[PDB]
């Protein structure tokens, strides 16, 4: 049985950089393959038999081998190349995969565009108010959202989720939801999300008054 | 065109079994080996085994020999993988893939969309869907944001499309968040021109296969 070590676990690079991933095997492998996987999608074959390009795969992708050491190279990293890459070997009737390498893209600073969504009548009829703050298309990934209700900082009543990096523009988006009972919602007037990010010189507040 | 279409996501109580299917089209089914691959959410990729539809030959990962049974039905061009004695750690996406060399020497490699199997004693629950309307509070420089919140479902996954897949530019469908309760919620949003909110129609199409829930919600200004 063949053990393999894939490195690095993750890397970040600029558009046009040469990216190199290595797969080191315990014993000589019969066949080496390289797969690319984007989040939510199936793996896609890029390289078979160490160095043969799968059909329709761009020429910037290549593979090589030197004993038990196998390399995969992207000669000029493109925004659409962000993915997790896996080596897969076959020997003696067994396929095994490497641990994967997540390849990320660096790009210029982009401040978020901020949007706020007051709870609908449909929501309030259900007994719960979910106030939604969206931060769209920003870079880098690090952002901070604070919720304020009548200028009082909230704690313990929000949730947030961040997207994977975008394959076209290399940005992220983030959604934050403040959840209150209908009764609690109706006790206050001003609902605000305050956003801090590297592209902003001071926090940006998006707000509304309940009932308008 | 080569297509491999897998059966829908499922939830299963511990100790149960599940049989996942993979329907092939666009090629001669018996001409290629069918593979099964596991990826638990968030152990990478593991190879389960392969089944040769031309002769019935199988090769398994020893790890899965007791767990998995691969079969085919050549009359319907369908491959199956049955998982028995399900436990929590069997929660994963399962892929089928047709992979091998042609006689000429080119490598044939195509994959199904994956099937998420969740092993849980918790009850399946369908989501509530709430439109997030475009308004003056969700505009930015001639663009409007709008969306749908898909609240309180179990287990994963929910999928969301817009206008039956005709609207994909500017869509962000976010990873689900785990609620205190153990349910999930997710949101999907899209940005569109603010100028044409009066003339275009935006419908979010929400699917949650474990509860066989399919909902289309018009999101109006």
Specify the DSSP element, H or E, that contains A184: helix A182-185
3-state secondary structure of A78: coil
In the structure encoding, which two tokens stand for residue B71, read together?
A: 């079969």
Nearest of B93, B75, B87 to residue B10 by alpha carbon: B93
Rg (CA), chain B: 21
Query: Is residue A93 within 8 Å of A75, Cβ to Cβ?
Result: no
Q: Tell me: domain A108-212, CATH 2.60.15.10, correct?
A: no
Can you say how many angstroms the Cα of residue B31 is from the centroid of all Cα atoms in its chain? Answer: 26
- CA atoms lying within 13 Å on the CB side of residue B42: 4
Can you say how many angstroms the Cα of residue A86 is from the centroid of all Cα atoms in its chain? Answer: 17
Nearest of B203, B142, B151, B219 to residue B179 by alpha carbon: B151
Query: Could you tell me the domains of chain B?
Result: 2-117 (no CATH), 118-221 (2.60.40.10)
Indicate if the alpha-carbon torsion angle A155, A158, A164, A169 is positive or negative.
negative
Mutation choice for A interface testing from B136, B174, B194 by most A CBs within 10 A: B174
Query: Is residue B205 within 8 Å of B213, Cβ to Cβ?
Result: no
Q: What is the resolution of this structure in A?
A: 1.5
DSSP 8-state secondary structure symbol assigned to residue A183: H
CB contact under 8 A, B45 and A54: no
Could you give the C-alpha distances from B49 to A99, B17, B81, B84, B99, in angstroms and in order?
Answer: 19, 18, 10, 15, 12
CA distance B114 to A184: 42
Could you give the C-alpha distances from A165 to A99, A104, A105, A174, in angstroms and in order?
Answer: 20, 8, 8, 11
CA distance A23 to A98: 7
CA distance B72 to B30: 10
Query: Is residue B219 within 8 Å of B191, Cβ to Cβ?
Result: no
Backbone φ, ψ for residue A6 (5° rounding) = -105, 135
What is the end-to-end Cα distance of chain B in Å, rounded? Answer: 40
Residue A84 region by backbone torsions, left for phi larger than 0, else alpha for psi between -120 and 50, else beta:
beta
In the structure encoding, which two tokens stand for residue B21, read together?
A: 């299917």
Nearest of A58, A59, A57, A68 to residue A32 by alpha carbon: A68
Backbone φ, ψ for residue B48 (5° rounding) = -85, -50
**Closest Cα in chain B, distance from residue A71 (Å):** 19
Backbone φ, ψ for residue B62 (5° rounding) = -50, -40
Could you give the C-alpha distances from B144 to A93, A181, B5, B87, B191, in angstroms and in order?
Answer: 55, 27, 36, 45, 5
3-state secondary structure of B81: strand
3-state secondary structure of B206: strand
Query: Is residue B11 within 8 Å of B124, Cβ to Cβ?
Result: yes
**Closest Cα in chain B, distance from residue A14 (Å):** 23
Provide the pairing of β-strand B58-60 with B115-119: unpaired
Could you give the C-alpha distances from B31 to B26, B54, B98, in angstroms and in order?
Answer: 12, 7, 10
3-state secondary structure of B191: strand
Task: Report domain A1-107's class.
Answer: mainly beta
Q: Give A76's contacts (C-beta < 8 A, 6+ positions apart).
A: A16, A17, A18, A60
Mutation choice for B interface testing from A56, A115, A173, A212 by most B CBs within 10 A: A115
Nearest of A208, A185, A207, A211 to residue A195 by alpha carbon: A207
Structure method: X-ray
Largest CA distance in chain A: 71
CA distance A194 to A179: 16
Query: Is residue A23 within 8 Å of A98, Cβ to Cβ?
Result: yes
The answer to whether domain A1-107 and domain A108-212 are alike in fold is yes
Cα-Cα-Cα-Cα torsion B162, B166, B168, B171, nearest 10 degrees, comes to: -20
Chain discontinuities in chain B, listed by preceding residue (C to N exceeding 2.5 Å)? 42, 43
Interface of A with B in 80-139 (CB under 8 A): 86, 88, 93-100, 113-118, 120, 122-123, 126, 130, 132, 134, 136
> Residue B15: how many CB atoms within 10 A of its CB?
11
> Residue A99: how many CB atoms within 10 A of its CB?
16
């Amino acid at each position: 049985d063949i053990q393999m070590t894939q490195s690095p676990s993750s890397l970040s690079a600029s558009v046009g950089d040469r990216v190199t991933i290595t797969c080191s095997a315990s014993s000589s492998v019969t066949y080496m393959y390289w797969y690319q996987q984007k989040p939510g999608k199936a793996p896609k074959l890029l390289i078979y038999d160490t160095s043969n390009l799968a059909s329709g795969v761009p020429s910037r992708f290549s593979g090589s081998g030197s004993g038990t050491d196998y390399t995969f190279t992207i000669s000029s990293l493109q925004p659409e190349d962000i993915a997790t890459y896996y080596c897969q070997q076959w020997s003696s009737h067994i396929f095994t995969f490497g641990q994967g390498t997540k390849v990320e893209i660096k790009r210029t600073v982009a401040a978020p565009s901020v949007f706020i969504f007051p709870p609908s009548d449909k929501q309030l009829k259900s007994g719960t108010a979910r106030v939604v703050c969206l931060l769209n298309n920003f870079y880098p990934r690090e952002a901070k959202v604070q919720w304020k209700v009548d200028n009082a900082l909230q704690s313990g009543n929000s949730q947030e989720s961040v997207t994977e990096q975008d394959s076209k523009d290399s940005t992220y988006s983030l959604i934050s939801t403040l959840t209150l009972s209908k009764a609690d919602y109706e006790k206050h007037k001003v609902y605000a999300c305050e956003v801090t990010h590297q592209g902003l010189s001071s926090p940006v507040t998006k707000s509304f008054n309940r009932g308008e | 065109q080569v297509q491999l279409v897998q059966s829908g996501a499922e939830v299963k109580k511990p100790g149960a079994s599940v049989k996942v299917s993979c329907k092939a089209s666009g090629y001669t089914f018996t001409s290629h080996w069918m593979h099964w691959v596991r990826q638990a959410p968030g152990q990478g990729l593991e190879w389960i085994g392969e089944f040769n539809p031309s002769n019935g030959r199988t090769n398994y990962n020893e790890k899965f020999k007791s767990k998995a049974t691969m079969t085919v039905d050549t009359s319907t061009n369908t491959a199956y993988m049955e998982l028995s004695s399900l436990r929590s750690e069997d929660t994963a996406v399962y892929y089928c893939a047709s992979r091998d060399y042609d006689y000429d020497g080119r490598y044939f490699d195509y994959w199904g969309q994956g099937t998420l199997v969740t092993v849980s004693s918790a009850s399946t629950k369908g989501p509530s869907v709430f439109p997030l309307a475009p308004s003056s509070k969700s505009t930015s420089g001639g663009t409007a944001a709008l969306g749908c919140l898909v609240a309180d479902y179990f287990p994963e996954p929910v999928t969301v499309s817009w206008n039956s897949g005709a609207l994909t530019s500017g869509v962000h469908t976010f990873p689900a968040v785990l609620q205190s309760s153990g349910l999930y919620s997710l949101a999907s949003v899209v940005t569109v021109p603010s100028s044409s909110l009066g003339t275009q129609t935006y419908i979010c199409n929400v699917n949650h296969k474990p509860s066989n829930t399919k909902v289309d919600e018009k999101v109006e200004p």
